[PDB]
From Swiss-Prot, chain A:
Changing residue 387 to S: No loss of activity. The gene is MAOB. Catalyzes the oxidative deamination of primary and some secondary amines such as neurotransmitters, and exogenous amines including the tertiary amine, neurotoxin 1-methyl-4-phenyl-1,2,3,6-tetrahydropyridine (MPTP), with concomitant reduction of oxygen to hydrogen peroxide and participates in the metabolism of neuroactive and vasoactive amines in the central nervous system and peripheral tissues. Preferentially degrades benzylamine and phenylethylamine. The modification S-8alpha-FAD cysteine is found at residue 395. Keywords: Acetylation, FAD, Flavoprotein, Membrane, Mitochondrion, Mitochondrion outer membrane, Oxidoreductase, Transmembrane, Transmembrane helix. It is an enzyme of class 1 (oxidoreductase). It is found in: Mitochondrion outer membrane. It comes from Homo sapiens (Human). Residues 1-487 are cytoplasmic. One of its GO terms (cellular component) is mitochondrial outer membrane. Its EC number is 1.4.3.21, 1.4.3.4. This is Amine oxidase [flavin-containing] B. Its main location: mitochondrion. Belongs to the flavin monoamine oxidase family. The keyword Protease does not apply.
Curated annotation (Swiss-Prot), chain B:
This is Amine oxidase [flavin-containing] B. It is an enzyme of class 1 (oxidoreductase). It comes from Homo sapiens (Human). Changing residue 392 to A: No loss of activity. The keyword Flavoprotein applies.
Length: 499, 494
């Protein structure tokens, strides 16, 4: 089977690459391991739920590429519910609030909290989005975990605990598992702490009507039979004039170039000839994905709205199986549902239970957090544990442990002869997200267009017009937020005065 | 085609497993990815070196299983040269010394150094060899890197620089890359700090005459055509009556049981049907191997001996490519040579250079440390960079980043239906060494004999009698080693 480009992987990244290549007149083939396209996006359809996203789902302002792609495919978005109050549940009690952060009243504690978020963003501006290893203190920040950085920065337990929950929620890993340099890069390349955490004006603002899985499905429709399902790639041979790509079900494909659009560590599932160079060879053993179970509990009505709760809950505590939820009710107001994430070590701990026992524990938690016995009367339940996926490795994305990003980072998207690398991990804006997948898939496709002499070099990286449907408000601070001292800053001032 | 047990991997561990099963009367096939056996051991032969070990090489007292296996195969050991003085090279100067640790003269520094070694051994006494996630402080120690532990414990830069070299040399990874729990288990399961670092009476005491690659080659000689080279395994299907194992060159093997005798992460190279359970599926993406180039510079004579140096050098500082060396001269006094390890980030850094550029750097360093122009005149050079090996992933062994050993560690040896797990990573004594490979391969082999009803449960794990050729002497401490206070302890008395 002969073509111009073989794309390995039919998730969003590979489908976007294939689409770009196909629209340019090339012959592409997509080799997908599963019986479906979409990868870490998956939309379940049945009569009880109508449709529901079990993997990637949320899109928001500044994610202009996935928005343009989805629009061009005939899809619409709608807004996640944030009309009523959010809830911060901490030490067994719920405190309703509005805004990006639960209010903090103790003035010392307020100083510590304000300095925490501020400093994450301050450190982040030192870090180039396209080369995090070029930060001036890249080595010092990469040689520490997030846990060590939090221990040094937070002068109250309250700030340390909120921060810990933010890390677990952002990257589905524990603070002691991840590099400080990598996590700080990861937040900055999504636009910063406010953009990444928020619903209104942030990452979680919207969902696609009908599910995100339609993105990959509609591209598959346009490509017709160029997409080969149940073709896991086992072997890539670059020793001859054309590249040979072999599949597990005994098929051979021959091409000029290959795009690898799979998570970096799943490159281990492929035997290479000749062997990868040393740096990539080791890099793909060093970059695990996080751990998460996405759970959706359905109810007769969205009862929390009547208590003036929008359904967003930040839930702190070792005993809480779920640390964050959002209202997952359909835009029409039916199929009332709460979506929650079970994160990092709790995904591993609670996977031992049955589905019915996990549903029990979530309802009892929601009943307590919402102060509502109706939470004990679910009508349906769907869930997916991504830790068990042979062809994903986890979700949402790949994290870097201490020391890895500075030593091996520069190789993530470095071509290996005629293999180019897409996949959301190799993006520079919303890496980890469906937005990053589109950016990486189209950039890798244009690297190949450039190698064939079809476009000039300055067209490999291409900026994206802002969505007219999902405008981005800028992220602003107040004068007090900018200039209030940190806790040790204030202690320093007290020392000074006392002389 | 059809057999009783397929062994995936022909390193020491897979070979030891296959030999045990074959000696029991079972039909075994070994499927090996490479065009050779040995894996992380590799013995090169040519007229210039005669033979040289480019991977695993050293054996010593308490490693009784690899000693017994080798002896049975007709191999012999000889002693690594440690007659003359060792060298510590620090801030551009050489300090010769005798005994296990370089002397320290500043009294505060002496207290700090003594406390560091003693504390590593005290912590390890609380970590079970067969279950390190059961240490009373497993989570606390697992959630910190060795770098954090060293920042807490070491009150002097001198103790911290030496501890840092110790970690790099021991596990070919940076102190900030590795779990404190995991590292402290690793040293304790080799018999502690003195046992692991010593030449005389420790893990570097001896080498095999003719090279360690002969262990695997000689088992392959026994097994004949049961061993298949250039058979990378790609697919294992357990959904039927018999297990089906497929290779890259399109052959199909069928067995009642499988032994996986490869580094855990190389498990990623195989597609599984049904999918692996969740905890193993993620575990095998979380366990990289270290980074090392092993380099051997040959000379006309072992000239360091005329200066009363043994050729063992401990070399501190960023600028030194090699932090540790041993005399690699043959027992006969000929093929004079110095072996050095380029460790961790330096392996990655110096890999960009050419072979000749690395040779020149090593020779200029050894000239400075040994104080001899003769080091500038090498007659030959051999080296191997293990980071580049598709079917090893690095060397010496698999390290655990912070958080991983407690969450996933119990999954390493757990059977997956009819697949049993060997490989030095699953051993409980000298895991990470050739000794651990033998332990783990023989244990996995006997779990299958037990699954078949051939032996009882209490025969899965078997003790090994002590080698008469390489007996162990006790590790001792002095009264002052045991009771001198630490730096904060001396301070508390003030
Ligand atoms: C899983 C998940 C979840 C659960 C969730 C989420 C997610 C996920 N996300 C992420 C996404 O999804 C991603 O990024 C994407 O999807 C990616 O794409 P790509 O790159 O394409 O990749 P994939 O998909 O994986 O694909 C691949 C393919 O390939 C294949 N393979 C493999 N291997 C192989 C193959 N083939 C052949 N051969 C071989 N060998 C496979 O199968 C596939 O298909 C996200 N995203 C977004 O955007 N959104 C969302 O939502 C999401 N998610 C989450 C979120 C969260 N959020 C939260 C809330 C609150 C907060 C947060 C964060 C932060 C802060 C705050
Ligand atoms: C590399 C190396 C070096 C450089 C060095 C050293 C070493 C290494 N070591 C280690 C040893 O060698 C080990 O442990 C062993 O060998 C292991 O075994 P096993 O377990 O068996 O594994 P391997 O080998 O890898 O095997 C595997 C096999 O398989 C195969 N594959 C894969 N994949 C696959 C396959 N097949 C089929 N299919 C598939 N898919 C491969 O190919 C192979 O073959 C060591 N050891 C000992 O014992 N000794 C020595 O010497 C060694 N080394 C090191 C040492 C050092 N020392 C130092 C000095 C001073 C000091 C130290 C340390 C500490 C302290 C002080
Ligand atoms: C007589 C006066 C003695 C008071 C001296 C106070 C000692 C300070 C210990 C507080 C530790 C606070 N955390 C946040 C844990 C670490 C800060 C890291 S950093 O110090 O800013 O580098
Ligand atoms: C720490 C961890 C999770 C969090 O989610 C929010 C949030 N969600 C919607 C507006 N703010 C804020 C926040 C802070
Ligand atoms: C730190 C790093 C490497 C080291 O090697 C020794 C040594 N080798 C032979 C006897 N002691 C001691 C030592 C301490």
């Amino acid at each position: 089977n002969k073509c111009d480009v073989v794309v390995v992987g039919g998730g969003i990244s590979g489908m976007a690459a294939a689409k770009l290549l196909h629209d340019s007149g090339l012959n592409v083939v997509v080799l997908e391991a599963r019986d479906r396209v979409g990868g870490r996006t998956y939309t379940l359809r049945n009569q009880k739920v109508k449709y529901v996203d079990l993997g990637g789902s949320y899109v928001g302002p500044t994610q202009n590429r996935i928005l343009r792609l989805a629009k061009e495919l005939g899809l619409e978005t709608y807004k996640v519910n944030e009309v009523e109050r959010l809830i911060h549940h901490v030490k067994g009690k719920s405190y309703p609030f509005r805004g990006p952060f639960p209010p903090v009243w103790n003035p010392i504690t307020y100083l510590d909290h304000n300095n925490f978020w501020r400093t994450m963003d301050d450190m982040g501006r030192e870090i180039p989005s396209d080369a995090p290893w070029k930060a001036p203190l890249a080595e010092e920040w990469d040689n520490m975990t997030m846990k060590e950085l939090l221990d040094k920065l937070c002068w109250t337990e309250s700030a340390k605990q909120l921060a810990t929950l933010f890390v677990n929620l952002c990257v589905t890993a524990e603070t002691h598992e991840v590099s400080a340099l990598w996590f700080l890069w990861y937040v900055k390349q999504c636009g910063g702490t406010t953009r990444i955490i928020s619903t209104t004006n942030g990452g979680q603002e919207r969902k696609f009507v009908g599910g995100s899985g339609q993105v990959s499905e509609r591209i598959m429709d346009l490509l017709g039979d160029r997409v080969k399902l149940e073709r896991p790639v086992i072997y890539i041979d670059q020793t001859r004039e054309n590249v040979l790509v072999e599949t597990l079900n005994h098929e051979m494909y021959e091409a000029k170039y290959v795009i690898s659009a799979i998570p970096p560590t799943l490159g281990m599932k492929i035997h290479f000839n000749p062997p990868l160079p040393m740096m990539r060879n080791q890099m793909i053993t060093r970059v695990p994905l996080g751990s998460v179970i996405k759970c959706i509990v359905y109810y007769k009505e969205p009862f929390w709205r009547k208590k003036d709760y929008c359904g967003t809950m930040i839930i702190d505590g070792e005993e809480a199986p779920v640390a964050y939820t959002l209202d997952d009710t359909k835009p029409e107001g039916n199929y009332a549902a709460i979506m929650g994430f079970i994160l990092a070590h709790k995904a591993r701990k609670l996977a031992r239970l049955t589905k019915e026992e996990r549903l029990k524990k979530l309802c009892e938690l929601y009943a307590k957090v919402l102060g509502s016995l109706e939470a004990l009367e679910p009508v349906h339940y769907e869930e997916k544990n991504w830790c068990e996926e042979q062809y994903s490795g986890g979700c949402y994305t790949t994290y870097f442990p201490p020391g890895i990003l500075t030593q091996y980072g520069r190789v993530l998207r470095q071509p290996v002869d005629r293999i180019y690398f897409a996949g959301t991990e190799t993006a520079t804006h919303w890496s980890g997200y469906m937005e990053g997948a589109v950016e990486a898939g189209e950039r890798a496709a244009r690297e190949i267009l450039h190698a064939m002499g079809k476009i000039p070099e300055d067209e490999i990286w291409q900026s994206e017009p802002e969505s007219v449907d999902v405008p981005a408000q800028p992220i602003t601070t107040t004068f007090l937020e900018r200039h209030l001292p940190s806790v040790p800053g204030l202690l320093r001032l007290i020392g000074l005065t006392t002389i």
